[PDB]
Design a binder for this molecule. Structure first.
Ligand SMILES: OC[C@H]1O[C@@H](O[C@H]2[C@H](O)[C@@H](O)[C@H](O[C@H]3[C@H](O)[C@@H](O)[C@H](O)O[C@@H]3CO)O[C@@H]2CO)[C@H](O)[C@@H](O)[C@@H]1O
Ligand SMILES: OC[C@H]1O[C@@H](O[C@H]2[C@H](O)[C@@H](O)[C@H](O[C@H]3[C@H](O)[C@@H](O)[C@H](O)O[C@@H]3CO)O[C@@H]2CO)[C@H](O)[C@@H](O)[C@@H]1O
Ligand SMILES: [Cl-]
Ligand SMILES: [Cl-]
Ligand SMILES: [Cl-]
Ligand SMILES: [Cl-]
Ligand SMILES: [Cl-]
Lengths: 984, 984
């Protein structure tokens, strides 16, 4: 009877039908655009020969002239526009080619003129300049992320403020945890991160609205946004020649300031020849303290608060705070205030409103009926809407500056807390920013801070999009993730705690912090993670103010050894091993770091091991889909059962916990690497007993992995111990019986390869075999997928049926973080394997995958690949090529590590092991490197083709002297050293 | 330094300052309005002599002419408008009185002309006619609630669809449980129940937007909404003489239909002399199946679905369905479709869009840039936005009708479910509604159904607002609550299950259902609740598809005896006692209803009792604030401990569970009443042993209550057993030591009074004493508060600090449900106490409180009292007098019972015990009453003053014969009986 046609099973696309109908009467070029003319998809209207994919038909249909013209033909007749000799025609299927009227021609020419820049462009410094009218490639593309600075202050991870800002300034602003200053929105669209009023304002003249910052109409003749490092600047010009500029940034902390302040400076320049009598109404919505009640009891959120007015020492109104009745919502205190600077005069708002209904009245948010006559009524209820009003006359050629300060004070940074604390901190803030120039000086301080931070590693290549993308944008993102982990963004809006394994972000950022004088901060972070390890050696899976989920995931603790290794090898500071740090078990017990690292290794190498002596998988490891064991236990439960086991079987602590639980081969690799790291740390610390014990244990673990986890053509991913008849014994290689793809024998996990190499277990022949499998079955046109198709229902009855269409997340996506771990392995192997042809191939795959993750390349074909050209995104949809959010992800961290690795830098016992792997087409690579007490200029030259030190002739010079030792010293002479490498 | 002034701490109001500055130069009358002119509140602009409180200054300030005129004086000078001799002046503080210009005079006159009706008015049939421009008193005031009809089909409570509709048609639409058809919004404002596009549409002409159903601009010359019983009709007239009418209702179920369908009919009449070529774009937003992910993972909500197009047998597009990948979201299937009826022609949509971003484009939702050129693109992702487009030419004087059908099919009503089921049900629906007249016939069927349902009890007084308010509006609300409990509304948006104690709704509705032939449905509901009682006698606190929270709250089971009593006494159907009903414990065990009722009584009378033999309080009872015992246990835990106790101490089942837990006196009253009810049921069932046992137990329980719970001047509320030194021993009367008000000795709970009377425990002297306490300490200007101020931290030695400002919810509100239980007691006592002066006073309090809850009276002073003039609201804020939502509440149920009781109707063993209690100023009361096999016309006459049968002379006649027996027979002769009562 009735039939259903889904988006995906729709049989033909508009552009395909356009080609079918017109592809032999006109040249459709390499790119075209088209729309179906009716809901049965029988006819199309399109346009030929575009420079890239873009929604041109949509923009044309918004044009009254072209839309009316098309109605002469559509829907009954298909049509294509075509340009010949710089004039436009419309072509019909019956052959006719009609020269379109002049007004249609002008509209078509204007529309196609700059299609290649419709998603914006990057400045030389890597800043994204966006047109406020153009369509968005996707909901993360036009987004900037802002952060405060709590370095030098307490609990930096938990207290640094953070904000998200789209091209219109939309978004939200948080203090500690998920505490909302400006309101988040949890609604249907990814595009709506915040309440729509946030950061927006109106201008009035003669009682009539002339401007709204989130409405572009015909009275706006220019409107652009620029996303830069830690600030966004939005500019408009009206037809009446008002020039409006918004600058948004977070205030770096200073003693006595509120815990969170966001500054928005608005500059209004009268570029006309007549004075104008204007007024501003600045609006927003405070976040509720009662977030769960938005879902559960909206009336509660309203009745528990009221608005309150703030007055300075002269009795002048300065702004609004939402005042709460319940004590639990009085431990933070929000505020908004504004200063109007008009020539000599400084003024504060003359009126306000605090009730959204009274403000909008009979109008809309874009055209509010009460916006020009604020009612000065303090709302007895929430929500905490605010509007602040002030008049100003602006003379010809002159500018008025309005500085807004939005923020929160908190008990999280102040003992004996009450709203009196907020009032004092707000006074301190406003006094600091009393002089107009103070805002500019703070912005310059922010700019200079991030510029200085980035100097640890600077590329200088022929490609300024790459150089700025790495030197500024990626460096900023890695700082951002060190402070924020995975806890905030455009679509990351729920409360998220810090995952233990996300210590990974510090793997990349620690060098940057050390080289701006914050080595102690790095140590503090190491110790903070260490305090989340239990005596037995498992870890809290998550923490924020305190830790939770003891030993729930089996991989967590092992990552901490990589962090300590990187820190100790770089700095040679073994003193951290003697630090007495609280154990996660509490009471009031502390343990030296060295003993905690030993315990981590013992847990995974000896206690929590399965029948093959490899680490147990438990609930899951790094991969949350490996819910193979449905009766798994956490570390606290395991600890209790273990002690009962020792008592019942007369065992000794350190003996194996006996079970038929499955084993994680990825954890085995993480462990082997961790053991190697501790052996090397111990040697540096002159701890001969520990070095020897760890060296021998590494050999033993390596033997277990080789004997029990190499399965013909790959390292397995999981060993299965509960089927004593052999029905299933492993997952992750040929013969595992678990493939869901009839054309693939076995399931293959990218991380089995990656971690077998990163841990230095895989032999050269094993690498060659695995790379062959990867090329055949894991390498897609959009990069390296995480795993091939698996049918885990055969062993994990528990198993979730799928949630995703093909291409998204677990149904076949390219997870870019995992792809970057695999690239790290490809790079490491390409430097060392004996066979130069294997090395060359692995480096080709490495650069192919890097090219698919570099954010700036998202502007090459933005309406297909989307993403964000300054900030990583999490995955590539393998059906469409679209880069899909969220923004914060391990991709950025590992991309940073990988590009530095390819440039040749690895820190080792005796200095910098230098071994660069350039692109085949590159003939030069230059970069600078900072160290704590010296600096370096590196220059590499080669002919076209694959070159590497292992197999190619070369000459290496340091400070003008030819040298054979490729381990460059870590100099401490406070001089710049010149390193030159020439491949012959 | 900086100071803070809250809404509540603000010293003086605008109107107070207006009177201070002007009150003896002009007559400000009984009502005025004013606004502060600046943020320091020094000056005011106001207007004198309004007919009621209303936001007149706000509306005047939206008027460009008046706003500009005021700027000649404000902000520096205070002003008041005044009308004298039908012309307006503005008065200044210096005494100047200036005749305002003619254009300002016209604007002021027009604005004040109809202030008395700014919040709308009620038709004679109780329908609320609302102006779409006027401000709202509050966020529940302009709301209607719609319901489907699943009578005669399975799982009626769980499957009846329901919708909320404001005056603009905003809101949302649900199927079973919290399953969203059209999307709910969980955001900052109580006003936003749904995604803003829901139910809204646009009209176009020559490619330009001429109308949006949720935008009133100057091209709209009339715009009104009418909320009636189970439908809303919204009407507009454009300046171009288009007349647009929207009619929204839910389709009653028919076999083969989808489980939920909402019909919106749009009629467009061309009342001009020229044909118009128009088009409509009909929009909305499907709700997500993944509601939790709106908060947790918005990207997930998008990627798990895609849009899909629907086609009829002829290959014509008919509408859209959102298609889901995960199996858990494929068990419901949503749809939207539309039919355009233009003269002889019927047509389906010619175009669609399914991507909000493409639809809005560079515009706004009110003015979407893609609305006139839908792109016919099926979105690969959610959210499930839809727009359906169709053209039509409408000739002069003619009408085009667009019928939209939005809905969902579900596995909850169909075995072997898939989307094929939806397609078949949608086909059935569209075939049924093929002919234009079918929509009108279905609407008339709905209207007639509710009119017939209401005939159980009809008032005929001189007061059509009261008569329609009761006969139509309250009757509908009580039906609504029987099907929906407390689970849906404007601000009730989270998932809520059916509370066991909300069987109370059936106390009022059962008589209505029985008198339309649905006695079997009433029995089925009795059995459904009965299946949520455990063998031991405690109950699941909540249920929906299954029950949960076994015995968590101590009162729950006792309410079931009231439902069985009302049913059995009305119908004399004792057969229900023999029904074998599943026990809540499961394991396929059943028990006869009679034995379950016995078990309920045994649990509260013998097992779960404290040191005084009164029922234990447990976590809490009816009052969720009585968290007195911090180590309480649920019934499952108690059952386990009880059996352990019996074994340890060699006890027998039925012995007391031993503890120092506190006792609930309200539960003791509910129990005493329950026992009396079972004794009477048993006597009717000729079960002499059970009747004797219950009669004796009632005496025993009464003695326990009198001996241990009467405390000098009140029945206590809780007896406390854990302080053996006597430090605290009770809560709820003089001497309890728990008052938080230094001027009150004791805490007094309204329900201690109410239930002491409803259970026939309180003596006449106890009633006199308690009513004196109530008058002194519980009766406020806004009605009966629930409790006086208490300091429970002294015994719950640390429970929650308060959450509310004074006046709201637990901080002193008038909870209208509890107020109506107290009124039930006052009425019962007024009928029977010996002292006529006590009776008179109690009846005065009863009618005072009724007047404060009757919805239609919310239109007397609507901008102060708000509420909703057709639907109850939950509480009155005792600081402001505002009636605050939610809408569904026990208020409506008990208001219905109380008004019928006051009219004199109580069903007893031998018929109708007739004992009416009229208002003192009433001289007449007439009403009709339906019974299953007869009907009645009642007429009561009296002189002015208090009259009642107990104390006043009267003559009673039935069918023209004077009778002395005031128990009127329940006649079964299928005749109308005339009952006349004349007080002398
Ligand atoms: O519905 C039962 C009772 O509700 C009480 O209001 C409660 C709110 O509904 C509830 O949301 C809130 O609980 C949280 C809130 O959800 C969360 O956002 C915030 O972080 O903490 C709040 C702490 O409670 O609690 C209140 C009060 O308990 C009504 O007061 C009551 O009438 C009603 O029976
Ligand atoms: O965050 C860890 C993993 O998340 C996975 O997506 C999950 C969604 O975030 C989660 O919302 C969903 O769970 C619910 C959903 O919350 C609720 O609305 C609905 O009723 O049921 C959903 C069923 O689960 O689950 C998915 C995963 O199943 C990512 O897939 C994964 O990459 C990530 O590690
Ligand atoms: Cl171009
Ligand atoms: Cl994000
Ligand atoms: Cl993995
Ligand atoms: Cl509600
Ligand atoms: Cl109570």
């Amino acid at each position: 009877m009735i039939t259903k046609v889904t988006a995906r099973n729709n049989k033909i696309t508009p552009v395909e039908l356009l080609n079918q109908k017109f592809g032999n009467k006109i040249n459709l070029g390499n790119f075209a655009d088209a729309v179906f003319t009716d809901a049965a998809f029988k006819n199309v209207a399109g346009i030929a020969n575009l420079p890239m994919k873009a929604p041109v038909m949509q923009v044309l249909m918004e044009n009254s002239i072209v839309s009316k013209y098309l109605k002469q033909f559509v829907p009954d007749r298909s049509v294509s526009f075509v340009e010949e000799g710089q004039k436009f025609y419309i072509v019909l299927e019956d052959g006719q080619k009609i020269e379109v009227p002049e007004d249609v021609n002008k509209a078509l020419k204007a529309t196609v003129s700059d299609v290649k820049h419709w998603a914006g462009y990057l400045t030389e410094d890597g800043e994204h300049v966006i047109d406020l009218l153009k369509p968005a490639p996707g909901p993360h593309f036009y987004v900037n992320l802002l952060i405060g600075n709590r370095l030098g202050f307490k609990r930096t991870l938990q207290t640094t403020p953070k904000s998200v800002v789209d091209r219109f300034g939309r978004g939200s602003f948080r203090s500690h945890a998920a505490t909302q200053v400006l309101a988040t929105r949890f609604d249907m669209r990814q595009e709506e991160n915040g309440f729509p009023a946030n950061r927006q304002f109106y201008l009035y003249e003669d009682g009539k609205q002339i401007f709204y910052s989130a409405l572009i109409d015909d009275n706006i003749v220019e409107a652009t946004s620029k996303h830069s490092s830690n600030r966004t600047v939005i500019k408009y010009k009206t037809a009446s020649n008002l020039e409006i500029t918004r600058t948004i940034f977070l205030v770096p902390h200073k003693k006595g300031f509120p815990l969170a302040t966001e500054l928005q400076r608005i500059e209004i320049k009268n570029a006309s020849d007549k004075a104008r009598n204007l007024s501003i109404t600045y609006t927003g919505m405070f976040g509720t303290g009662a977030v769960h009640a938005i879902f559960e009891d909206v009336t509660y959120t309203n009745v528990i608060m009221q608005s309150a007015a703030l007055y300075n020492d002269k009795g002048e109104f300065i702004g609004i705070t939402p005042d709460y009745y319940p004590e639990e919502f009085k431990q933070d205190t929000r505020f908004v205030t504004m200063i109007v600077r008009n020539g000599d005069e400084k003024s504060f708002p003359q009126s306000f409103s605090t009730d959204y209904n009274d403000f909008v009245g009979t109008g809309t948010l874009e055209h509010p009926a009460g916006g020009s006559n604020l009612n000065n009524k303090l709302n007895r209820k929430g929500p905490g809407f605010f509007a602040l009003g002030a008049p100003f006359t602006v003379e010809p050629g002159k500018t008025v500056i309005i500085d807004t300060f939005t923020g929160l004070s908190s008990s999280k940074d102040n003992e004996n807390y009450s709203d009196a604390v907020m009032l004092r901190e707000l006074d301190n803030l406003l006094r600091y920013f009393e002089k107009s120039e103070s805002v500019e000086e703070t912005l310059n301080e922010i700019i200079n801070f991030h510029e200085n931070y980035g100097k640890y590693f600077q590329f200088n290549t022929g490609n300024k999009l790459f150089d700025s993308g790495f030197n500024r944008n990626l460096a900023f993102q890695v700082l951002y993730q060190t402070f924020m982990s995975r806890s905030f963004g455009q679509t990351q809006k729920g409360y998220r705690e810090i995952g233990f394994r996300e210590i990974q972000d510090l793997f990349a950022s620690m060098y940057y912090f050390i080289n701006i004088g914050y080595q102690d901060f790095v140590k503090e972070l190491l110790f903070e993670w260490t305090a989340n390890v239990y005596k037995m050696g498992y870890a809290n899976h998550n923490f924020y103010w305190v830790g939770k989920q003891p030993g729930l995931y089996s991989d967590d603790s092992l990552w901490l050894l990589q962090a300590y290794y990187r820190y100790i090898i770089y700095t040679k500071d073994t003193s951290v091993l003697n630090e007495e740090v609280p154990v996660a078990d509490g009471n009031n017990e502390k343990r030296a770091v060295r003993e905690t690292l030993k315990a981590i290794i013992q847990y995974s190498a000896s206690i929590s091991v399965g029948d093959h002596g490899l680490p147990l998988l438990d609930l899951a490891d790094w991969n949350d889909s490996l819910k193979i064991d449905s009766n798994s236990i956490d570390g606290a439960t395991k600890e209790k059962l273990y002690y009962e086991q020792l008592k019942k079987t007369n065992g000794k602590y350190g003996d194996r916990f006996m079970s038929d639980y499955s084993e994680s081969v990825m954890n085995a690799f993480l462990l082997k690497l961790a053991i190697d790291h501790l052996a090397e740390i111990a040697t540096l610390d002159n701890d001969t007993q520990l070095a020897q014990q760890m060296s021998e244990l590494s050999k033993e673990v390596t033997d277990r992995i080789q004997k029990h986890a190499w399965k013909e053509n790959f390292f397995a991913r999981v060993l299965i111990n509960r089927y004593k008849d052999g029905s299933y014994t492993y997952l992750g290689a040929k013969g595992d019986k678990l493939s869901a793809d009839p054309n693939i024998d076995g399931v293959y996990f990218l991380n089995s390869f990656a971690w077998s190499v990163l841990s230095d277990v895989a032999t050269d022949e094993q690498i060659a075999i695995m790379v062959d499998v990867i090329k055949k079955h894991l390498l897609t046109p959009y990069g390296l997928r995480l795993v091939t198709p698996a049918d885990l229902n055969k062993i994990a009855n528990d198993t979730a049926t799928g949630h995703y269409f093909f291409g998204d997340r677990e149904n076949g996506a390219v997870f870019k973080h995992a792809s970057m771990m695999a690239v790290a392995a490809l790079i490491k192997a390409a430097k060392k394997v004996k066979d130069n042809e294997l090395a060359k191939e692995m480096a080709r795959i490495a650069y192919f995958m890097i090219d698919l993750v570099l954010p700036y390349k998202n502007l090459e074909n933005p309406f297909q690949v989307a993403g964000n050209p300054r900030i990583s995104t999490q995955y590539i949809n393998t059906d469409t090529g679209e880069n899909i959010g969220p923004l914060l992800s391990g991709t950025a961290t590992w991309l940073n590590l990988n590009l530095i690795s390819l440039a040749g830098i690895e820190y080792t016992r005796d200095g910098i092991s230098f071994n660069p792997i350039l692109r085949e087409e590159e003939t030069q690579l230059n970069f600078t490197l900072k160290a704590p007490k010296s600096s370096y200029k590196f220059s590499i030259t080669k002919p076209v083709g694959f070159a590497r030190m292992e197999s190619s002739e070369y000459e290496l010079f340091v400070d003008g002297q030819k040298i054979d030792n490729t381990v460059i010293p870590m100099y401490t002479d406070e001089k710049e050293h010149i390193v030159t490498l020439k491949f012959k």
